[PDB]
Amino acid sequence: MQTFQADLAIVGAGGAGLRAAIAAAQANPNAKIALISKVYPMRSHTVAAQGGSAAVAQDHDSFEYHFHDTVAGGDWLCEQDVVDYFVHHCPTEMTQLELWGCPWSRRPDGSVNVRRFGGMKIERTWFAADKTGFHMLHTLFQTSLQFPQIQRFDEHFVLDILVDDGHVRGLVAMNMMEGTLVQIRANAVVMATGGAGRVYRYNTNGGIVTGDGMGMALSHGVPLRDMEFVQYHPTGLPGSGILMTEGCRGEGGILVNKNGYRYLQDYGMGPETPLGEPKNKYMELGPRDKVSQAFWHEWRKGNTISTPRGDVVYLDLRHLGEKKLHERLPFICELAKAYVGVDPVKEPIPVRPTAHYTMGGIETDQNCETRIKGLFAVGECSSVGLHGANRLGSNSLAELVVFGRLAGEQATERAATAGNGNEAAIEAQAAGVEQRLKDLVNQDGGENWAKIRDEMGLAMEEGCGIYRTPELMQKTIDKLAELQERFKRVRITDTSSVFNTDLLYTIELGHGLNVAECMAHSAMARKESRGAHQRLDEGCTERDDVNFLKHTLAFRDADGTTRLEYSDVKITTLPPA
Amino acid sequence: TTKRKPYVRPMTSTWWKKLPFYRFYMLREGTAVPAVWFSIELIFGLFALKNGPEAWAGFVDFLQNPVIVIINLITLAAALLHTKTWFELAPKAANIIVKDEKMGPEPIIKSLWAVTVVATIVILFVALYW
Amino acid sequence: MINPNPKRSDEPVFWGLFGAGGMWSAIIAPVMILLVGILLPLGLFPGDALSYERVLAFAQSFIGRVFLFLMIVLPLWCGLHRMHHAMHDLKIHVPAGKWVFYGLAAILTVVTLIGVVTI
Amino acid sequence: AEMKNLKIEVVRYNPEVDTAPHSAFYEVPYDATTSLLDALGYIKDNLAPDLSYRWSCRMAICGSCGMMVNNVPKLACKTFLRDYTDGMKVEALANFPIERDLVVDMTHFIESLEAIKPYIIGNSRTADQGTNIQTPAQMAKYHQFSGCINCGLCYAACPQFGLNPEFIGPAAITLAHRYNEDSRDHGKKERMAQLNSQNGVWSCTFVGYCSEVCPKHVDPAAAIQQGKVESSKDFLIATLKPR
Ligand code: SF4
Ligand code: F3S
Ligand code: FES
């Protein structure tokens, strides 16, 4: 164990924890901030975002409009005070990004343009071409360079945080390249490890998204909340599940069946529209889950088109003719012809719905602080409660930036009061981070992790997806239960010590193996339906605010079980309607 | 110690010989050898056309020699290649903006060529006709 | 690691020349090879428009004096600069190269500038 | 149907064990959608758990999965087995030093990416104030030079770099140029000093192979020339400078 002292320690470097570095870095110039991440910061998932960050900006807009949009969007499950605050800071924070010189796309007058996204009335999505998340992350990552206060621990996979007497005291990590562990001591830790989607078979999430952060959190008695709302994107390339952005639908895309009948005209999405007039809230820019539901509806009807990729529908764009595209729709094009062989003018891109975002997360109060004093979480790995039951397109990057600075600050501050904990216990707790990891390495037993991985992911996909039924969730718990047992029986071939991904991969599979268990019970218990979680069993097919207006809290326990608790949803000026 | 042994590859002189794009790169560059020799011929020319007509006729004799004449066409080939290649690169250092997009090479290349076309003649009419 | 403060190379001089070099050797050089290299001694040129008598006229007269300087010179700089580099690009150690070539590139600018001022 | 089989050659190299990289042969199942990344996966997944290598986004956006395929620089990410039926040799991205298997130490890359100060310098305005203004026009000036994903492929195509490792490389200069050309910046002085050095833009013989391999169509080499034209304008002003 080589140790290092540090004022604060940030796990992860995509959007949020990147912005958190920056923040802490200026709340206090003399601070020693350590930014850990398992990959150079710039390849974090936040690169792949396309749509944009939400931020109230038009003159005819209004924070009430954006506030009310967000609540109803999520179905009241959002904590309103948190939402309130979120809405009111997005415009500062996007400006500041434009101040650090991120290339937002513009209007002939040199001011900032907006786009339609996520089913709101008054548009407010700021965007840098079709490439928004890349411009953000890349723009935060260079900006951070001008501050020596931030010392990056790059390619350093983080094993466990340190905890004692109700408080955080540090973390442990492996230098990937070197094969050894430092132990970083700090008295605040912002957890911003980002996403849980890769625990599904099909999805849009890059390889790094495996739940690391949320896992470590469970192991310290901290709960995951709203863990069963998983959000699905309507248009996923078959197989890869690569994202086709809503944008193209919004620029004139079609979605059609084997008969190419434009089918979302009868799932209460119709009055059809003209090729030219695509209209908000209707047919192809109709309501999120609606579109996804019509796939399943049209899937169950023998109507989807069968490929080796899997069943599909078709989104048509062939009817836009260049110039339309290349100005506003270029990557999508390159995507099409690459990953499936379809040139956006002569045939149609096969798209099926696919797994996308984790509305769930580590419980946090309004400042991003967990029940463990000094521990914060920010970003998609966390549950401040902006999204409640269903994220709104474009609000997610907005989050990173907005709450990642507040996490940045608050963290800082907390770190300036901690007083010292027991410098004996903690050491002996990092101590056990080593012993523990080791009891993993020698495991003799022989399971290819790899099968467990394919097997979980599939389980997730079948019994915890768009349309959910008891009988099936029950399968998924039972599966997981089993995978869980079986992981204790997988032996790890590479005993090598340098960039040994055989190991790191396994460690991460173990974690999702815990987030998973933790979204299936959440779900099977939510006998009602909301935003993204829809069951068909008789009795629980409507939204119930009499007894289902609360956040689900899942807690892995020490004896290995998953246990629930329901806390209430905070209301202010918009009662359930 | 570390358990790492960062292996570094050899970068030979046969390097350019491998890829057919480096091969071609080296070429454009050899284009200079002849381009200088021709500058030397020209000089001899300058000094013979001064040692007096007896000599300048012997310069021309050297130019009559078959050898010198393969070599000299080859000189023309280099040149022509350089002229082609060169025109396609200069453009790539001008960063101009038309309508509201940033323009491409297609257009300058065209004039750099017209200007060659015209000079080539306006010069051949001068040394040959007037 | 990446040396904080670095020394401002002086290459924007040979390069600058070389620019002029390449552009001239690119519009005007093919045509003249044609004349002096082929047309002239292949006798394929009308009457007596390319014979001691006439050539000397031009050579001797100013704008034909300025002309042969540039036609000799630039193509020298240009190509010399390129074979300089072209040396390294091939991993060949040339003792004092910078002076050799641009050295030679000056000597010969002198010889030429001489011929041109004398007659 | 019934699915084809390709036979991949991937170059393995261990520090702890081997003394030099060496070849290896894997047989991979495949269809018309199978990518190099995809196969790399199939391998570790069921015949060689020991292979390690870099990847994440899966859609040629993140910039981790670059390597060499038959001497050409590429993204595993976006390379399909269908285009390599007569054979396929995969080495670690050239011009960088192999640490292990298909992963190579990219610190020079970063160190350089850093050195040229890739951030807006000296622009006072603050949020309460609003964004700065910048026209679809101004934007255009540096736009393309902003699509770099730090993938490192240009660095594995420019011999000038593989002949001189102190050279800050295409990307680096490009990135810099981008901030330099961006109407809202004020740190051009702050950035030239590198650029004007010998391992700055003047280490470029304009081979052009970097612009040829860029997966995000940035054209690094147009950026470097512009560099030159600017270095050179800088050298002149400073020859009129001694003051
Ligand atoms: S310029 Fe292109 S090739 Fe080079 S690192 Fe950037 S994206 Fe890669
Ligand atoms: S290939 Fe190399 S020589 Fe210059 S043009 Fe690109 S950096
Ligand atoms: S894995 Fe992202 S560039 Fe290919």
PDB file of N, CA, C and O in Angstrom, chain A residues 218-276:
ATOM      1  N   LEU A 218     -23.351   0.265  -1.988  1.00  0.00           N
ATOM      2  CA  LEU A 218     -24.172  -0.719  -1.361  1.00  0.00           C
ATOM      3  C   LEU A 218     -23.449  -1.322  -0.212  1.00  0.00           C
ATOM      4  O   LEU A 218     -24.022  -1.428   0.855  1.00  0.00           O
ATOM      5  N   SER A 219     -22.185  -1.663  -0.412  1.00  0.00           N
ATOM      6  CA  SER A 219     -21.351  -2.400   0.566  1.00  0.00           C
ATOM      7  C   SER A 219     -21.097  -1.654   1.840  1.00  0.00           C
ATOM      8  O   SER A 219     -20.519  -2.152   2.769  1.00  0.00           O
ATOM      9  N   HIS A 220     -21.533  -0.436   1.870  1.00  0.00           N
ATOM     10  CA  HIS A 220     -21.357   0.424   3.015  1.00  0.00           C
ATOM     11  C   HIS A 220     -22.611   0.853   3.517  1.00  0.00           C
ATOM     12  O   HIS A 220     -22.767   2.001   3.910  1.00  0.00           O
ATOM     13  N   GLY A 221     -23.510  -0.081   3.522  1.00  0.00           N
ATOM     14  CA  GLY A 221     -24.841   0.207   3.946  1.00  0.00           C
ATOM     15  C   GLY A 221     -25.507   1.380   3.278  1.00  0.00           C
ATOM     16  O   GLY A 221     -26.375   1.889   3.768  1.00  0.00           O
ATOM     17  N   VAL A 222     -25.138   1.839   2.145  1.00  0.00           N
ATOM     18  CA  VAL A 222     -25.773   3.057   1.594  1.00  0.00           C
ATOM     19  C   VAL A 222     -26.824   2.568   0.573  1.00  0.00           C
ATOM     20  O   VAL A 222     -26.541   1.745  -0.248  1.00  0.00           O
ATOM     21  N   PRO A 223     -28.021   3.158   0.546  1.00  0.00           N
ATOM     22  CA  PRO A 223     -28.919   2.599  -0.460  1.00  0.00           C
ATOM     23  C   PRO A 223     -28.955   3.131  -1.901  1.00  0.00           C
ATOM     24  O   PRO A 223     -28.407   4.183  -2.234  1.00  0.00           O
ATOM     25  N   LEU A 224     -29.602   2.383  -2.773  1.00  0.00           N
ATOM     26  CA  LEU A 224     -29.680   2.722  -4.146  1.00  0.00           C
ATOM     27  C   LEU A 224     -31.092   3.059  -4.111  1.00  0.00           C
ATOM     28  O   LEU A 224     -31.807   2.410  -3.426  1.00  0.00           O
ATOM     29  N   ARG A 225     -31.492   4.117  -4.767  1.00  0.00           N
ATOM     30  CA  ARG A 225     -32.886   4.452  -4.799  1.00  0.00           C
ATOM     31  C   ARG A 225     -33.345   4.623  -6.189  1.00  0.00           C
ATOM     32  O   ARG A 225     -32.566   4.929  -7.044  1.00  0.00           O
ATOM     33  N   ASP A 226     -34.653   4.446  -6.325  1.00  0.00           N
ATOM     34  CA  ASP A 226     -35.430   4.451  -7.565  1.00  0.00           C
ATOM     35  C   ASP A 226     -34.777   3.548  -8.572  1.00  0.00           C
ATOM     36  O   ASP A 226     -34.920   3.683  -9.773  1.00  0.00           O
ATOM     37  N   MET A 227     -34.221   2.512  -8.013  1.00  0.00           N
ATOM     38  CA  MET A 227     -33.415   1.633  -8.785  1.00  0.00           C
ATOM     39  C   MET A 227     -34.100   0.800  -9.898  1.00  0.00           C
ATOM     40  O   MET A 227     -33.449   0.344 -10.820  1.00  0.00           O
ATOM     41  N   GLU A 228     -35.436   0.715  -9.899  1.00  0.00           N
ATOM     42  CA  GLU A 228     -36.158  -0.058 -10.935  1.00  0.00           C
ATOM     43  C   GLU A 228     -36.647   0.701 -12.211  1.00  0.00           C
ATOM     44  O   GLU A 228     -37.018   0.069 -13.201  1.00  0.00           O
ATOM     45  N   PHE A 229     -36.651   2.040 -12.198  1.00  0.00           N
ATOM     46  CA  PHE A 229     -36.936   2.768 -13.439  1.00  0.00           C
ATOM     47  C   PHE A 229     -35.641   2.640 -14.345  1.00  0.00           C
ATOM     48  O   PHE A 229     -34.621   3.232 -14.058  1.00  0.00           O
ATOM     49  N   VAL A 230     -35.655   1.738 -15.327  1.00  0.00           N
ATOM     50  CA  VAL A 230     -34.543   1.689 -16.292  1.00  0.00           C
ATOM     51  C   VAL A 230     -35.044   2.396 -17.608  1.00  0.00           C
ATOM     52  O   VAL A 230     -35.976   2.112 -18.142  1.00  0.00           O
ATOM     53  N   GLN A 231     -34.424   3.349 -18.179  1.00  0.00           N
ATOM     54  CA  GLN A 231     -35.017   3.947 -19.385  1.00  0.00           C
ATOM     55  C   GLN A 231     -34.409   3.480 -20.729  1.00  0.00           C
ATOM     56  O   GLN A 231     -33.203   3.427 -20.918  1.00  0.00           O
ATOM     57  N   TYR A 232     -35.309   3.213 -21.663  1.00  0.00           N
ATOM     58  CA  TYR A 232     -35.068   2.528 -22.943  1.00  0.00           C
ATOM     59  C   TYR A 232     -35.176   3.467 -24.110  1.00  0.00           C
ATOM     60  O   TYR A 232     -36.082   4.244 -24.151  1.00  0.00           O
ATOM     61  N   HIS A 233     -34.331   3.357 -25.120  1.00  0.00           N
ATOM     62  CA  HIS A 233     -34.330   4.425 -26.132  1.00  0.00           C
ATOM     63  C   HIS A 233     -35.038   3.793 -27.276  1.00  0.00           C
ATOM     64  O   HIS A 233     -34.678   2.735 -27.672  1.00  0.00           O
ATOM     65  N   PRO A 234     -35.963   4.497 -27.890  1.00  0.00           N
ATOM     66  CA  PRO A 234     -36.676   3.878 -29.007  1.00  0.00           C
ATOM     67  C   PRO A 234     -36.009   3.316 -30.200  1.00  0.00           C
ATOM     68  O   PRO A 234     -36.437   2.321 -30.795  1.00  0.00           O
ATOM     69  N   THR A 235     -34.937   3.986 -30.583  1.00  0.00           N
ATOM     70  CA  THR A 235     -34.213   3.555 -31.747  1.00  0.00           C
ATOM     71  C   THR A 235     -32.746   3.100 -31.638  1.00  0.00           C
ATOM     72  O   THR A 235     -31.809   3.879 -31.804  1.00  0.00           O
ATOM     73  N   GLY A 236     -32.618   1.811 -31.391  1.00  0.00           N
ATOM     74  CA  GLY A 236     -31.372   1.136 -31.312  1.00  0.00           C
ATOM     75  C   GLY A 236     -31.008   0.274 -32.499  1.00  0.00           C
ATOM     76  O   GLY A 236     -31.787  -0.571 -32.828  1.00  0.00           O
ATOM     77  N   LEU A 237     -29.909   0.566 -33.189  1.00  0.00           N
ATOM     78  CA  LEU A 237     -29.419  -0.429 -34.152  1.00  0.00           C
ATOM     79  C   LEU A 237     -29.479  -1.847 -33.532  1.00  0.00           C
ATOM     80  O   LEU A 237     -29.276  -2.096 -32.364  1.00  0.00           O
ATOM     81  N   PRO A 238     -29.826  -2.786 -34.353  1.00  0.00           N
ATOM     82  CA  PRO A 238     -29.938  -4.160 -33.906  1.00  0.00           C
ATOM     83  C   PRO A 238     -28.609  -4.635 -33.509  1.00  0.00           C
ATOM     84  O   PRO A 238     -27.665  -4.165 -34.005  1.00  0.00           O
ATOM     85  N   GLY A 239     -28.536  -5.556 -32.588  1.00  0.00           N
ATOM     86  CA  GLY A 239     -27.283  -6.161 -32.202  1.00  0.00           C
ATOM     87  C   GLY A 239     -26.375  -5.382 -31.297  1.00  0.00           C
ATOM     88  O   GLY A 239     -26.161  -5.811 -30.178  1.00  0.00           O
ATOM     89  N   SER A 240     -25.824  -4.275 -31.769  1.00  0.00           N
ATOM     90  CA  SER A 240     -24.935  -3.403 -30.996  1.00  0.00           C
ATOM     91  C   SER A 240     -25.741  -2.685 -29.987  1.00  0.00           C
ATOM     92  O   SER A 240     -25.326  -2.455 -28.863  1.00  0.00           O
ATOM     93  N   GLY A 241     -26.913  -2.328 -30.468  1.00  0.00           N
ATOM     94  CA  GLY A 241     -27.795  -1.458 -29.745  1.00  0.00           C
ATOM     95  C   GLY A 241     -27.252  -0.039 -29.869  1.00  0.00           C
ATOM     96  O   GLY A 241     -27.459   0.679 -29.066  1.00  0.00           O
ATOM     97  N   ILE A 242     -26.604   0.388 -30.883  1.00  0.00           N
ATOM     98  CA  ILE A 242     -26.006   1.719 -30.985  1.00  0.00           C
ATOM     99  C   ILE A 242     -27.005   2.804 -31.116  1.00  0.00           C
ATOM    100  O   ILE A 242     -27.909   2.664 -31.886  1.00  0.00           O
ATOM    101  N   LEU A 243     -26.829   3.921 -30.446  1.00  0.00           N
ATOM    102  CA  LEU A 243     -27.868   4.896 -30.565  1.00  0.00           C
ATOM    103  C   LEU A 243     -28.028   5.570 -31.925  1.00  0.00           C
ATOM    104  O   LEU A 243     -27.028   5.979 -32.523  1.00  0.00           O
ATOM    105  N   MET A 244     -29.287   5.625 -32.377  1.00  0.00           N
ATOM    106  CA  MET A 244     -29.744   6.445 -33.528  1.00  0.00           C
ATOM    107  C   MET A 244     -30.422   7.606 -32.758  1.00  0.00           C
ATOM    108  O   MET A 244     -31.306   7.364 -32.077  1.00  0.00           O
ATOM    109  N   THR A 245     -29.981   8.833 -32.840  1.00  0.00           N
ATOM    110  CA  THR A 245     -30.558   9.934 -32.017  1.00  0.00           C
ATOM    111  C   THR A 245     -31.978  10.370 -32.305  1.00  0.00           C
ATOM    112  O   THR A 245     -32.408  10.262 -33.463  1.00  0.00           O
ATOM    113  N   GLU A 246     -32.723  10.866 -31.316  1.00  0.00           N
ATOM    114  CA  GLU A 246     -34.114  11.342 -31.617  1.00  0.00           C
ATOM    115  C   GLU A 246     -34.024  12.369 -32.726  1.00  0.00           C
ATOM    116  O   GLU A 246     -34.889  12.477 -33.577  1.00  0.00           O
ATOM    117  N   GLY A 247     -32.924  13.094 -32.748  1.00  0.00           N
ATOM    118  CA  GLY A 247     -32.794  14.075 -33.768  1.00  0.00           C
ATOM    119  C   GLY A 247     -33.334  13.651 -35.101  1.00  0.00           C
ATOM    120  O   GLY A 247     -34.136  14.377 -35.638  1.00  0.00           O
ATOM    121  N   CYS A 248     -32.985  12.461 -35.593  1.00  0.00           N
ATOM    122  CA  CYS A 248     -33.380  12.171 -36.982  1.00  0.00           C
ATOM    123  C   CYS A 248     -34.885  12.062 -37.141  1.00  0.00           C
ATOM    124  O   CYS A 248     -35.463  12.628 -38.062  1.00  0.00           O
ATOM    125  N   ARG A 249     -35.527  11.389 -36.214  1.00  0.00           N
ATOM    126  CA  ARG A 249     -36.983  11.453 -36.154  1.00  0.00           C
ATOM    127  C   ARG A 249     -37.480  12.946 -36.231  1.00  0.00           C
ATOM    128  O   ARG A 249     -38.245  13.269 -37.156  1.00  0.00           O
ATOM    129  N   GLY A 250     -37.081  13.802 -35.276  1.00  0.00           N
ATOM    130  CA  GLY A 250     -37.287  15.259 -35.381  1.00  0.00           C
ATOM    131  C   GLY A 250     -36.928  16.072 -36.649  1.00  0.00           C
ATOM    132  O   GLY A 250     -37.330  17.221 -36.765  1.00  0.00           O
ATOM    133  N   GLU A 251     -36.192  15.472 -37.597  1.00  0.00           N
ATOM    134  CA  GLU A 251     -35.818  16.100 -38.886  1.00  0.00           C
ATOM    135  C   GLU A 251     -36.538  15.442 -40.068  1.00  0.00           C
ATOM    136  O   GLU A 251     -36.155  15.598 -41.203  1.00  0.00           O
ATOM    137  N   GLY A 252     -37.544  14.675 -39.781  1.00  0.00           N
ATOM    138  CA  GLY A 252     -38.234  14.001 -40.845  1.00  0.00           C
ATOM    139  C   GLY A 252     -38.041  12.478 -40.842  1.00  0.00           C
ATOM    140  O   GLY A 252     -38.186  11.861 -41.885  1.00  0.00           O
ATOM    141  N   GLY A 253     -37.719  11.824 -39.749  1.00  0.00           N
ATOM    142  CA  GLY A 253     -37.817  10.357 -39.832  1.00  0.00           C
ATOM    143  C   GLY A 253     -39.204   9.675 -39.679  1.00  0.00           C
ATOM    144  O   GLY A 253     -40.059  10.110 -38.939  1.00  0.00           O
ATOM    145  N   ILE A 254     -39.351   8.591 -40.442  1.00  0.00           N
ATOM    146  CA  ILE A 254     -40.417   7.639 -40.463  1.00  0.00           C
ATOM    147  C   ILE A 254     -40.084   6.327 -39.622  1.00  0.00           C
ATOM    148  O   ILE A 254     -38.904   5.969 -39.420  1.00  0.00           O
ATOM    149  N   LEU A 255     -41.140   5.710 -39.039  1.00  0.00           N
ATOM    150  CA  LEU A 255     -41.004   4.352 -38.453  1.00  0.00           C
ATOM    151  C   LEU A 255     -42.185   3.507 -38.960  1.00  0.00           C
ATOM    152  O   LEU A 255     -43.351   3.855 -38.809  1.00  0.00           O
ATOM    153  N   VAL A 256     -41.829   2.406 -39.611  1.00  0.00           N
ATOM    154  CA  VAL A 256     -42.821   1.576 -40.254  1.00  0.00           C
ATOM    155  C   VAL A 256     -42.554   0.043 -40.147  1.00  0.00           C
ATOM    156  O   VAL A 256     -41.420  -0.381 -39.932  1.00  0.00           O
ATOM    157  N   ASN A 257     -43.646  -0.732 -40.304  1.00  0.00           N
ATOM    158  CA  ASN A 257     -43.800  -2.199 -40.180  1.00  0.00           C
ATOM    159  C   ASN A 257     -43.445  -2.951 -41.466  1.00  0.00           C
ATOM    160  O   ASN A 257     -42.960  -2.335 -42.411  1.00  0.00           O
ATOM    161  N   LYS A 258     -43.664  -4.288 -41.542  1.00  0.00           N
ATOM    162  CA  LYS A 258     -43.294  -5.010 -42.809  1.00  0.00           C
ATOM    163  C   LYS A 258     -43.977  -4.486 -44.057  1.00  0.00           C
ATOM    164  O   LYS A 258     -43.390  -4.512 -45.111  1.00  0.00           O
ATOM    165  N   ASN A 259     -45.155  -3.902 -43.841  1.00  0.00           N
ATOM    166  CA  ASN A 259     -46.031  -3.212 -44.804  1.00  0.00           C
ATOM    167  C   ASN A 259     -45.782  -1.708 -44.775  1.00  0.00           C
ATOM    168  O   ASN A 259     -46.496  -0.919 -45.403  1.00  0.00           O
ATOM    169  N   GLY A 260     -44.751  -1.318 -44.052  1.00  0.00           N
ATOM    170  CA  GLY A 260     -44.364   0.056 -43.996  1.00  0.00           C
ATOM    171  C   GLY A 260     -45.546   0.935 -43.724  1.00  0.00           C
ATOM    172  O   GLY A 260     -45.540   2.123 -44.064  1.00  0.00           O
ATOM    173  N   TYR A 261     -46.568   0.395 -43.126  1.00  0.00           N
ATOM    174  CA  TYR A 261     -47.665   1.265 -42.746  1.00  0.00           C
ATOM    175  C   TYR A 261     -47.157   2.073 -41.567  1.00  0.00           C
ATOM    176  O   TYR A 261     -46.541   1.512 -40.669  1.00  0.00           O
ATOM    177  N   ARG A 262     -47.410   3.368 -41.545  1.00  0.00           N
ATOM    178  CA  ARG A 262     -46.740   4.173 -40.511  1.00  0.00           C
ATOM    179  C   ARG A 262     -47.562   3.942 -39.290  1.00  0.00           C
ATOM    180  O   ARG A 262     -48.517   4.660 -39.010  1.00  0.00           O
ATOM    181  N   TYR A 263     -47.162   2.915 -38.539  1.00  0.00           N
ATOM    182  CA  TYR A 263     -47.993   2.341 -37.457  1.00  0.00           C
ATOM    183  C   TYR A 263     -48.271   2.989 -36.074  1.00  0.00           C
ATOM    184  O   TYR A 263     -49.071   2.495 -35.283  1.00  0.00           O
ATOM    185  N   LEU A 264     -47.631   4.095 -35.727  1.00  0.00           N
ATOM    186  CA  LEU A 264     -47.924   4.607 -34.390  1.00  0.00           C
ATOM    187  C   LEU A 264     -49.079   5.570 -34.392  1.00  0.00           C
ATOM    188  O   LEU A 264     -49.192   6.387 -33.509  1.00  0.00           O
ATOM    189  N   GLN A 265     -49.911   5.440 -35.428  1.00  0.00           N
ATOM    190  CA  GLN A 265     -51.137   6.202 -35.690  1.00  0.00           C
ATOM    191  C   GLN A 265     -52.249   5.551 -34.974  1.00  0.00           C
ATOM    192  O   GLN A 265     -53.305   6.123 -34.918  1.00  0.00           O
ATOM    193  N   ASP A 266     -52.033   4.317 -34.429  1.00  0.00           N
ATOM    194  CA  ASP A 266     -53.088   3.710 -33.586  1.00  0.00           C
ATOM    195  C   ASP A 266     -52.730   3.177 -32.245  1.00  0.00           C
ATOM    196  O   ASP A 266     -53.091   2.064 -31.887  1.00  0.00           O
ATOM    197  N   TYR A 267     -52.037   3.920 -31.494  1.00  0.00           N
ATOM    198  CA  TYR A 267     -51.715   3.555 -30.131  1.00  0.00           C
ATOM    199  C   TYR A 267     -51.945   4.878 -29.446  1.00  0.00           C
ATOM    200  O   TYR A 267     -51.301   5.193 -28.446  1.00  0.00           O
ATOM    201  N   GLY A 268     -52.945   5.582 -29.949  1.00  0.00           N
ATOM    202  CA  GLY A 268     -53.286   6.918 -29.493  1.00  0.00           C
ATOM    203  C   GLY A 268     -52.199   7.871 -29.875  1.00  0.00           C
ATOM    204  O   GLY A 268     -51.650   8.566 -29.036  1.00  0.00           O
ATOM    205  N   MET A 269     -51.821   7.844 -31.144  1.00  0.00           N
ATOM    206  CA  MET A 269     -50.771   8.676 -31.679  1.00  0.00           C
ATOM    207  C   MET A 269     -51.115   9.070 -33.060  1.00  0.00           C
ATOM    208  O   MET A 269     -50.267   9.284 -33.945  1.00  0.00           O
ATOM    209  N   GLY A 270     -52.419   9.216 -33.116  1.00  0.00           N
ATOM    210  CA  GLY A 270     -52.868   9.620 -34.309  1.00  0.00           C
ATOM    211  C   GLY A 270     -54.166  10.128 -34.794  1.00  0.00           C
ATOM    212  O   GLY A 270     -55.305   9.725 -34.586  1.00  0.00           O
ATOM    213  N   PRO A 271     -53.606  11.094 -35.440  1.00  0.00           N
ATOM    214  CA  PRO A 271     -53.981  11.987 -36.486  1.00  0.00           C
ATOM    215  C   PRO A 271     -52.612  11.709 -37.418  1.00  0.00           C
ATOM    216  O   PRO A 271     -51.674  12.423 -37.105  1.00  0.00           O
ATOM    217  N   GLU A 272     -52.380  10.819 -38.460  1.00  0.00           N
ATOM    218  CA  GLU A 272     -51.018  10.756 -39.048  1.00  0.00           C
ATOM    219  C   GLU A 272     -50.530  12.170 -39.311  1.00  0.00           C
ATOM    220  O   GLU A 272     -51.319  13.061 -39.614  1.00  0.00           O
ATOM    221  N   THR A 273     -49.228  12.291 -39.546  1.00  0.00           N
ATOM    222  CA  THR A 273     -48.630  13.508 -40.043  1.00  0.00           C
ATOM    223  C   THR A 273     -48.064  13.415 -41.591  1.00  0.00           C
ATOM    224  O   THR A 273     -47.705  12.342 -42.058  1.00  0.00           O
ATOM    225  N   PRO A 274     -48.084  14.582 -42.329  1.00  0.00           N
ATOM    226  CA  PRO A 274     -47.423  14.793 -43.653  1.00  0.00           C
ATOM    227  C   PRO A 274     -45.886  14.528 -43.522  1.00  0.00           C
ATOM    228  O   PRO A 274     -45.315  14.841 -42.479  1.00  0.00           O
ATOM    229  N   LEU A 275     -45.248  14.121 -44.638  1.00  0.00           N
ATOM    230  CA  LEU A 275     -43.836  13.704 -44.592  1.00  0.00           C
ATOM    231  C   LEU A 275     -43.104  14.874 -44.043  1.00  0.00           C
ATOM    232  O   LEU A 275     -42.276  14.770 -43.125  1.00  0.00           O
ATOM    233  N   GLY A 276     -43.467  16.015 -44.607  1.00  0.00           N
ATOM    234  CA  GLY A 276     -42.962  17.306 -44.157  1.00  0.00           C
ATOM    235  C   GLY A 276     -43.387  17.749 -42.767  1.00  0.00           C
ATOM    236  O   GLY A 276     -42.543  18.093 -42.014  1.00  0.00           O
TER     237      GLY A 276
END
